[PDB]
Design an enzyme around this catalytic site. Structure first.
Site, PDB file in Angstrom:
ATOM      1  N   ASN A 261      47.223  -1.516 -55.064  1.00 51.34           N
ATOM      2  CA  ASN A 261      48.309  -1.460 -56.047  1.00 51.34           C
ATOM      3  C   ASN A 261      48.835  -0.057 -56.366  1.00 51.34           C
ATOM      4  OD1 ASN A 261      46.420  -0.452 -57.952  1.00 51.34           O
ATOM      5  ND2 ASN A 261      46.122  -2.445 -58.947  1.00 51.34           N
ATOM      6  N   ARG A 262      48.297   0.973 -55.702  1.00 47.28           N
ATOM      7  CA  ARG A 262      48.724   2.368 -55.888  1.00 47.28           C
ATOM      8  C   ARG A 262      49.756   2.816 -54.849  1.00 47.28           C
ATOM      9  NH1 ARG A 262      43.699   1.387 -56.069  1.00 47.28           N
ATOM     10  NH2 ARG A 262      43.226   2.534 -54.166  1.00 47.28           N
TER      11      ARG A 262
ATOM     12  N   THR B 119      42.546  -1.475 -45.488  1.00 51.63           N
ATOM     13  CA  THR B 119      43.988  -1.325 -45.108  1.00 51.63           C
ATOM     14  C   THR B 119      44.113  -0.092 -44.223  1.00 51.63           C
ATOM     15  OG1 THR B 119      44.500  -2.316 -47.217  1.00 51.63           O
ATOM     16  CG2 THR B 119      46.395  -1.268 -46.032  1.00 51.63           C
TER      17      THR B 119
ATOM     18  N   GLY C 107      45.971   1.784 -49.873  1.00 51.97           N
ATOM     19  CA  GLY C 107      45.799   2.110 -51.300  1.00 51.97           C
ATOM     20  C   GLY C 107      46.151   1.024 -52.313  1.00 51.97           C
TER      21      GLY C 107
HETATM   22  N1  LIG Z   1      40.952  -2.059 -55.661  1.00 48.23           N
HETATM   23  C1  LIG Z   1      41.599  -2.748 -54.500  1.00 48.23           C
HETATM   24  C2  LIG Z   1      42.672  -3.735 -54.965  1.00 48.23           C
HETATM   25  C3  LIG Z   1      43.994  -3.115 -55.375  1.00 48.23           C
HETATM   26  C4  LIG Z   1      45.085  -4.161 -55.440  1.00 48.23           C
HETATM   27  O1  LIG Z   1      45.352  -4.800 -54.391  1.00 48.23           O
HETATM   28  O2  LIG Z   1      45.661  -4.354 -56.540  1.00 48.23           O
HETATM   29  C5  LIG Z   1      42.200  -1.780 -53.468  1.00 48.23           C
HETATM   30  O3  LIG Z   1      42.333  -0.572 -53.713  1.00 48.23           O
HETATM   31  N2  LIG Z   1      42.605  -2.356 -52.336  1.00 48.23           N
HETATM   32  C6  LIG Z   1      42.915  -1.598 -51.131  1.00 48.23           C
HETATM   33  C7  LIG Z   1      41.599  -1.344 -50.392  1.00 48.23           C
HETATM   34  C8  LIG Z   1      41.734  -1.004 -48.920  1.00 48.23           C
HETATM   35  C9  LIG Z   1      42.332   0.352 -48.660  1.00 48.23           C
HETATM   36  O4  LIG Z   1      42.128   0.828 -47.528  1.00 48.23           O
HETATM   37  O5  LIG Z   1      43.009   0.907 -49.552  1.00 48.23           O
HETATM   38  C10 LIG Z   1      43.926  -2.325 -50.222  1.00 48.23           C
HETATM   39  O6  LIG Z   1      44.983  -1.807 -49.792  1.00 48.23           O
HETATM   40  O7  LIG Z   1      43.687  -3.482 -49.879  1.00 48.23           O
END
Ligand SMILES: N[C@@H](CCC(=O)O)C(=O)N[C@@H](CCC(=O)O)C(=O)O
EC number: 2.3.2.-
Lengths: 166, 280
Positions: free
Chosen positions: A70-71, A1, A68
């Site tokens: 689900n954060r 992302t 990030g």
């Molecule tokens: N651990 C994954 C899934 C979390 C979720 O979608 O519930 C995660 O942290 N995904 C992220 C990874 C890519 C980034 O750059 O953060 C995301 O936003 O897809």
């Protein structure tokens, strides 16, 4: 992302977040590019916590967002809370170490004291330090001072984020 | 000039975005350029094989374009990026598309200097992804090193096809055939991809009007949390860490719950003072 923000001469603000949903998606690769993985959260789109956002008042425009997963809103809320209540520059706030929650666990970017840990322990959240900077996101923002007509910004060092204006 | 700005997670995206704007381009045109550059130079994080969403707020209009992948009939969704950018261009852009793809194409064809973060991303991903198809990213079997020039010839070809043919260059023809074979997705699902144009979620917070990403994005959740944090005056505890953290945990599980029960109806009403009033 990845999240970016642009503001042009007309004061139009774009706030965009693009993704593959895991780094290099599934890792499957064809025609020179990596294919996304799709979270199971026909032509349906799955739910995402991505949240490109713009805030506007007389005198100020803000474009902001973050990767990030689900954060994301856990990352953005304390940042915007501190900013709007006057705590400092958006960039200083972005630099501050972060925390997020997952069920009963508090994920923390730094080692917290036994002092604060025990307060949380009887709350009763348990605490675990996460060792990946990217885990706590990558907040990117621009701010236009609409009175004086100047654009500033902030980037997240966790992702080598930067910004420029004219 | 006139004032303008770019904030992005790669300095080459910042640079190319600023170049468009310096030469008189719009936020939308720069965003298309930036999105494509990021797909090339920040390839671990986004690109033509994925999707996204874009909020556009001008003096006179508010728009959200949803180009998230769609499920076909590993789990891989039909990519929305290329269709998104073309839709955005045709409805909100100014300069012709060809010009806007060229900076990305140059970095694909001529190369760019890899940084420490792409090396480390490749390093950590190697167990999950490293295959015989990936030799340019793992020269002599190891992640390409910081400072090295990464050249992406196959991607340049694809991007040049899109530059010449439009979105058909991705969603039909040889590229579509390549995606179909690799992802196990029918040519029909690939061709049938459609962008959605949505109204931004609009609320208020701390005297700001707030525009954010609607369902299936989570702008409602973010704005609920912001409004909850305002009302509960959690900032008064900002110097007292255990209290701040605990109070934030409470606000986030309330909002995450609300999203959950409503995963399975107006988003503006879901971020209203009165809705936030009733949240528990
Ligand atoms: N651990 C994954 C899934 C979390 C979720 O979608 O519930 C995660 O942290 N995904 C992220 C990874 C890519 C980034 O750059 O953060 C995301 O936003 O897809």
């Amino acid at each position: 992302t990845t999240h970016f923000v642009i503001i042009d001469r007309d004061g139009t603000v774009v706030s965009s977040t693009n993704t593959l949903s895991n780094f290099f998606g599934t890792g499957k690769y064809t025609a020179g590019f990596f294919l996304n993985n799709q979270l199971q959260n026909p032509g349906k789109r799955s739910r995402t916590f991505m949240a490109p956002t713009v805030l506007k008042k007389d005198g100020e425009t803000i474009g902001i967002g973050s990767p990030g997963g689900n954060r994301i809103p856990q990352i953005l809320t304390p940042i915007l809370d501190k900013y709007t209540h006057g705590k400092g520059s958006l960039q200083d706030i972005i630099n501050e170490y972060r925390f997020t929650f997952e069920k009963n666990t508090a994920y923390t970017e730094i080692q917290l004291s036994s002092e604060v840990k025990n307060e949380l322990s009887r709350k009763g959240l348990n605490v675990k330090k996460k060792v990946s900077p990217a885990f706590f996101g990558g907040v990117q923002a621009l701010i236009k001072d609409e009175r004086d007509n100047v654009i500033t910004g902030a980037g997240d060092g966790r992702r080598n984020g930067t910004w420029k204006s004219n | 000039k006139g004032t303008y700005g770019v904030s992005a997670s790669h300095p080459l995206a910042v640079e190319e975005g600023m170049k468009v704007l310096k030469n008189g381009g719009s936020a939308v045109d720069a965003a298309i350029v930036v999105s494509y550059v990021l797909g090339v130079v920040e390839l671990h994080a986004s690109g033509i094989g994925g999707g996204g969403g874009m909020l556009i707020i001008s003096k006179d209009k508010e728009t959200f374009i949803d180009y998230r992948e769609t499920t076909p009939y590993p789990h891989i969704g039909v990519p929305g990026f290329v269709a998104g950018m073309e839709y955005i261009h045709d409805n909100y852009g100014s300069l012709p598309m060809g010009e806007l793809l060229q900076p990305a194409i140059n970095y694909a064809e001529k190369g760019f200097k890899v940084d420490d973060s792409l090396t480390m991303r490749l390093d950590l991903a190697k167990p999950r992804i490293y295959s015989d198809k990936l030799s340019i990213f793992y020269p002599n079997g190891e992640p390409i090193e910081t400072g090295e020039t990464l050249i992406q010839t196959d991607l340049a070809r694809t991007l040049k096809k899109i530059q010449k043919e439009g979105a058909k260059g991705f969603y039909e023809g040889g590229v579509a055939r390549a995606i179909s074979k690799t992802a196990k997705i029918s040519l029909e699902d690939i061709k049938g991809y459609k962008v959605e144009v949505r109204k931004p979620v609009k609320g208020n917070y701390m005297g700001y009007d707030v525009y954010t990403a609607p369902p299936p994005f989570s702008g409602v959740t973010l704005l609920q949390m912001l409004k909850l944090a305002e009302k509960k005056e959690v900032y008064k505890d900002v110097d007292h860490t255990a209290t701040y953290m605990s109070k934030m945990e409470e606000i986030s599980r309330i909002a995450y719950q609300d999203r959950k029960k409503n995963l399975g109806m107006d988003p503006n009403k879901m971020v209203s003072d009165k809705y936030i009033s009733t949240m528990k």
